[PDB]
Amino acid sequence: TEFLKPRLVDIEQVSSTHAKVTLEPLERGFGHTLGNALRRILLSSMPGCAVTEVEIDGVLHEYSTKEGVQEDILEILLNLKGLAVRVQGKDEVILTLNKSGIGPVTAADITHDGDVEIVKPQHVICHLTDENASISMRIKVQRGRGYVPASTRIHSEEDERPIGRLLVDACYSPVERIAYNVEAARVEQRTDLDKLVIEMETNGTIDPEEAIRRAATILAEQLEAFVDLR
Amino acid sequence: TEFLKPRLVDIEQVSSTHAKVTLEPLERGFGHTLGNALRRILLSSMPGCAVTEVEIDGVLHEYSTKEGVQEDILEILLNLKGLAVRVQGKDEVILTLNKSGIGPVTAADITHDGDVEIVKPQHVICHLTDENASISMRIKVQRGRGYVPASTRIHSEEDERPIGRLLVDACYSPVERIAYNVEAARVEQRTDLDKLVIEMETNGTIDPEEAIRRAATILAEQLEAFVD
Amino acid sequence: DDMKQSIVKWLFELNAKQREVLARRFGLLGYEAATLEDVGREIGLTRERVRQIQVEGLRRLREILQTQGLNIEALFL
Amino acid sequence: DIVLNPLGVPSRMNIGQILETHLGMAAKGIGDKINAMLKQQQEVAKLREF
Amino acid sequence: ARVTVQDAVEKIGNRFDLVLVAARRARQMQVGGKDPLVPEENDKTTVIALREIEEGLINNQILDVRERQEQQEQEAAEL
Amino acid sequence: RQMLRKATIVNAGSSDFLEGEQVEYSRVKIANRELEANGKVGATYSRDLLGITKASLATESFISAASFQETTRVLTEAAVAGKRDELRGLKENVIVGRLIPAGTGYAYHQDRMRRRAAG
Amino acid sequence: EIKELLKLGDLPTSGQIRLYDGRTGEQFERPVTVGYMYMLKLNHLVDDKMHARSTGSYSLVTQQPLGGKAQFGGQRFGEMEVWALEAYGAAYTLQEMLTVKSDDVNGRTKMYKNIVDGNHQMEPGMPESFNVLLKEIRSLGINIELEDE
Amino acid sequence: EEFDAIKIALASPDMIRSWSFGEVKKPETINYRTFKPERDGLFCARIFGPVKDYECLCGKYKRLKHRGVICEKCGVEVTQTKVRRER
Amino acid sequence: REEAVVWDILDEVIREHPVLLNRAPTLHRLGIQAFEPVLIEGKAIQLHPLVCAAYNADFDGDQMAVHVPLTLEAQLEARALMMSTNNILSPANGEPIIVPSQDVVLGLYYMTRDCVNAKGEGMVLTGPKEAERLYRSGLASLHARVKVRITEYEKDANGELVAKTSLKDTTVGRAILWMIVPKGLPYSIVNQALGKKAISKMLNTCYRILGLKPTVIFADQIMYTGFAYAARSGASVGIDDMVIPEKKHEIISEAEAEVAEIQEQFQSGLVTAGERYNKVIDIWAAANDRVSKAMMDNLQTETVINRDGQEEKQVSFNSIYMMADSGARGSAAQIRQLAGMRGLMAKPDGSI
Amino acid sequence: KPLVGTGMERAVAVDSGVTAVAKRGGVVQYVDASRIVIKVNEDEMYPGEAGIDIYNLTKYTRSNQNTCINQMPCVSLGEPVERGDVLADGPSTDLGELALGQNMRVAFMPWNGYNFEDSILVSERVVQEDRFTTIHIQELACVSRDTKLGPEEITADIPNVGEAALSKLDESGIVYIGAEVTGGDILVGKVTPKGETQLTPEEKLLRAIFGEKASDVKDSSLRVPNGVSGTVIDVQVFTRDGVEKDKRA
Amino acid sequence: QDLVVTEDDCGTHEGIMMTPVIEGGDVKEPLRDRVLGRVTAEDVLKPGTADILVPRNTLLHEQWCDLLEENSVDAVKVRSVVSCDTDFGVCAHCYGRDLARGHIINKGEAIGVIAAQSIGEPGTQLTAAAESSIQVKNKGSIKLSNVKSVVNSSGKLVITSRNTELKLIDEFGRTKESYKVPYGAVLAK
Ligand SMILES: Nc1nc2c(ncn2[C@@H]2O[C@H](COP(=O)(O)OP(=O)(O)OP(=O)(O)O)[C@@H](O)[C@H]2O)c(=O)[nH]1
């Protein structure tokens, strides 16, 4: 046993979305070992917040068109799937959006809750063309993980069945893209050591450092079964 | 987070060398995630002891043939690569082997050191045919990990390499073979879950179960960098 | 088949004088499907006592279908 | 996005799909380069040149 | 037996007769509730019949023997 | 072999074959076994080759013949001959929805054949 | 022209790239052709293609199950399909598909009851289509009668 | 139900009359209003049997209570409707 | 209502119950085969690759029919007579119909086939397990020439197997495939670079020595390892893989002057139209052979850039060629219209 | 749009007529999902009329193959437009070019036999992005006929129906607009007059026990085909002249 | 249709004597492959007639077929379906091995259907003639049969017979290669 632990060295946040994380020193071959095993967890298991439910007044179904609005209701739903939201305290929040006049409705027009951060305020939701047109809607954001479509959700719950509530495919998973590059790290004696450079691209919020901590946690939690129980 | 942990289900020890281990349930994709990351540690990183250096008297190179011996020197070296040895105290030991007469030379003919255990005493090393034939050699056993060939050692270490010192590919890693198969596991609701079947083949001293425990340990030891 | 056989099982689980007028009326065991007034030709020879005994057989059998697990379960079909 | 079997090409003799794939990649390469220059916001002059 | 039927076929010989013999035995366990010789190990009557034939416990002639044995003892009881 | 099923008898036997009748070679050889034992007038014959289509129509079974082809003609020929098919072939049994006289069915079908032989 | 366009993309002349197995993280032994193919989802869906039936409606004269998934149809086991069972020697499977599965009206109900009672006993009879054939032949003015045993 | 062999021969006029359970003398199928078979028509229930199980046409005899009964009124035997494919 | 408990019951019933799969058209008895069903969420039937041969089933939108053997007799008919494991050999010729195709052959070809030195030429390995360990560890290619020591099991005069340990010169790849090989078969069968033609003989040999059970498991193993290594190989279809003859334009201009000579001999009224037709067709038929031969020598043995000593020749590792040579896919006439010349096409008449 | 095209894509899309094209060049006065108003330029604009073209766009309608035909507006409010330009895209067209499917990142290589004979291995990412997801508009009809026994009713009042089922039906017996439905849910309630049927002696006995006499009104209700599931986007009612109209109609 | 295995052994001595197909230079169908799993008739031994080699009623196993090649058997009487004496079917012996099973056919199996399917399927599924000159490849003595040639002005053996065959006789005296020499062909020797 020549046990040797890595330490988190550099967190280069080129952007809130894109971040590089260098990691050293890693013993020879552990670069790819951890690199890949982490990449798999990072793409799937990572939890986040996403739009589950939408309710626009004067809208019975997603296939209709609202007058004074360029986008069809489905187009608007697609935009909300891609809305970046961070919820600090609660797991479920309902944000309200009332906007009027000749304006491209952005994410900033939503009444922000005390503990609710809209990460991309300029994010487009809807285009109001007629000045007399006013749009009013209630966007329900829940916290979860992976991809939970509206087809899996219309075949389980359904105790309350309100006509005029639009269910939306939840894209909870924050990790958009991840790649890990393994370069050689040089110690005075050990030149076979390696550094692991993990390039992450996530939607809004989920912090690069925080995500890595959670990903390593889930791996160690699974390893409990192979350590503790034999 | 609804953290879903697997639980160790079946340990089928078909043999002390060969063992199958089924594992369920694993959340979707974690079968290959754990499967491979473990396989890598189990093969290249598991530590043990192996023959690094050989010196037979009257042998200048590995390609020659010694009279009164069925096996070519290469054949003998191949047999030493597969020699199971446990060293308790020291990291480097030189064992001496002097044997004569009409005998299949086994591992037991080696003069065992106080803290040196030959795990497979019946292990074949050489076949002496002529009764007048006597073989005398010094087998250097070092402790290491993974697979270190002599081709990757000559290019790196260019210090002392005098003639007659027979270099042999070092197999410190005790894991002889490992494969992990991922099949789907069924829950009443979750059919996307998977089971991980890890077939291990290990040599002497190191037990299949023991090795797996140590493998997960080495991974968790490097998982302290990011706190949790 | 299952429906017709089911009743028979619970038809012999009632009283001896409750399944000797209820079946001899519907024509289940008997030869001819009689009416309330026609059951008098056998041995009953009554009009009100036949109607009380018919429905008494039916009421004890309704509770035999409620306990085995039918009643409202077998109502839809 | 997709993994197709190459064993369904030499027998089929439909090499159009391969050329489409190479050119499609080249088209997407230019797209990724314009995408990179728009993310940086270099300027009208430089985008025009490329 | 379950995957490969070859050893079971080599006991009786005629594939067609193997099917008839294992079907008649499986009908016994299916309807009579006749007790299995081999541990079922949670297998269907069909599989049990074929295992029994592979090991050489069931046979057209042996079935016919136990048929007359039990039928004749019942005739003895009647008279 | 199926093409060489039939044979034309040139010269009378001890049965009612006589010149020019075309019968299955199986049946005339079985007749020749009984002639060998009894002597009597032996039957001289010649084997004939038949094309697949005509060979299928030459089978004694009119159910088989009609099911194949030419159905209007087959049934007029059978109806006028007053032909009776005792059902031996697979086709015929499949049509009435019965057990095949082959494979699994050979066991049961021979058990029937002995029930038929003994009454 | 395409290779020149690839070079403006800083992509390789081969259009083959180094790819990594998502599972293992190790590279594939050699370059793989990677790029963008314009693809189509055809009208043929699995929701419109998958069909299953145990028991359902039966045809008017022939009494065999109907055709087509929209009418809840049985798959046709055709002459060619029959011959395959004949080759195999599987006599009961064949008779089954001729009788209890198809026309035999007594057989199918009796068989159903046997299946729910666990006992997979075969209780076959005569296909209703054959009865019809005979009646159709007699309507043609040809006497076709059954000589009993 | 189980027979040994099958014979085909010429249909005698007299043989054809053996199978027949009545002479059809009208082109009439059913009545336009009561979709019920017309007298001595191609669908005559008086000849080929009852439309409904154990039911005469005019409905005088119903259920197994009247088994082999021939309704004097409509002239229909009370039996299984199965016979309409047989007779 | 599809209640939770109903799925567990369904699971109970289908176990040990064979089901018939059928594909149109049913040309021979193997067009229908029985399998043990495995319940899957998702609406498509999953078919075993090795029996795709019997069905002629390619998944370009093919559909199949499912039939339930109901009676105990029908179930036993399915399990004994119609089970896929029981019906391997064609009834037409005494040949196994269940034979790897496509990816499977390509993978095994890739493993067995040798390269010059590469990673770890002339190493010495204790068992095929050390070989597997070396390959996946990344200190040996599958094509590395190596003096390994494998112990083959040869059958004696009786039913007893005589084992024999020896050092042969095979690749790492061949050692690893030996692990799939049952005990009883010789090592020399796998020691060659394996193609579809050799793998069928492998299955035949296995059937005649070992019997049914071993062949069935062996066939499955071969399928798994075949796909597995096919995917590892990262083999693909480039535009550089289609090599054409450096001497095409010469052969064509020559053949074109030749055809012009016979056209001129026609214009002189000596050679008939029919004779010229035949001689023009003969000139082009020979031109086609020569160009194809040129492509195939240029492609087959194009790897004339080796090492160790000096310049050495070996079989080309062109993906397209490998595919044709293994018999995985493509042929010598398929490569003609992929790099050489298309050739002469014959009309709907039949005439060229 | 297809990255690797030929050029015919534009001509096919425009010439097919499924795309709304501009009759006359000018500036867009009013964009909407439902319609497009363009104000014509003075040079093309006739001296008679106001000179403002209004194109009403055809929205989510059924195709003959039960696919979805929708016209999306592809102009911005107040944009200068040339005559014969694409104002709105048809179902399979992108900015006037033909878009029949979707280009994506493909690699040619064997993969564990999941691409065996042309079999295709696709990333979950494509499913998630819902890009290959498709719309099918299906049309279910409920016919109230006049029979020998009497007229059929379209009431919500049906023998043996749970309040769960009748929740989605209005007073008339027709499902509400926007309501999500799955196999077996009733879309339109319909009940049919039952004449005489000889009740088996066991049913005579059984109905004597329970007492619930077989209601004369039977059940012919149009329900969701087994295994299809979707959202009601529209309802149409055809009545003859003089039958009492449903509350829903 | 009707043809089924009815009997085990018809007890017939009948069969058809088969030979090796040597069409061209590569042996298209060997005798071993053409008589594999076919009930041999009478007693077929080795060339030198002085000792028996194979039994009368014996299935042709790969073993006995290998021995046939070492003994160089020219031609062998094999039991055939056509020569079967079984009435209303054929015996397992006259047929031989069920090719699909790899052993002797089971009585009761419906052979005819299998035969017709086997012949028909390939046709149904399947739905450079510059032969200027024959080159002989191994050394041998030229052996013509069914040939009537005449010498010409040039000095060349021109053939004036339609079905002329050309054999290639080895050292001991057996047929290795075989060709079709057509009418009006010019022979070298
Ligand atoms: N019965 C029937 N089968 C068809 C028809 N059209 C195509 N097929 C089948 O679908 C398949 C299409 O050709 P392929 O199967 O690709 O040909 P292949 O045998 O794979 O040969 P290669 O293309 O050289 O690999 C064939 O096997 C045909 O049998 C048809 O009209 N009728």
Ligand SMILES: [Mg+2]
């Ligand atoms: Mg296909």
Ligand SMILES: [Zn+2]
């Ligand atoms: Zn009446």
Ligand SMILES: [Zn+2]
């Ligand atoms: Zn015979």
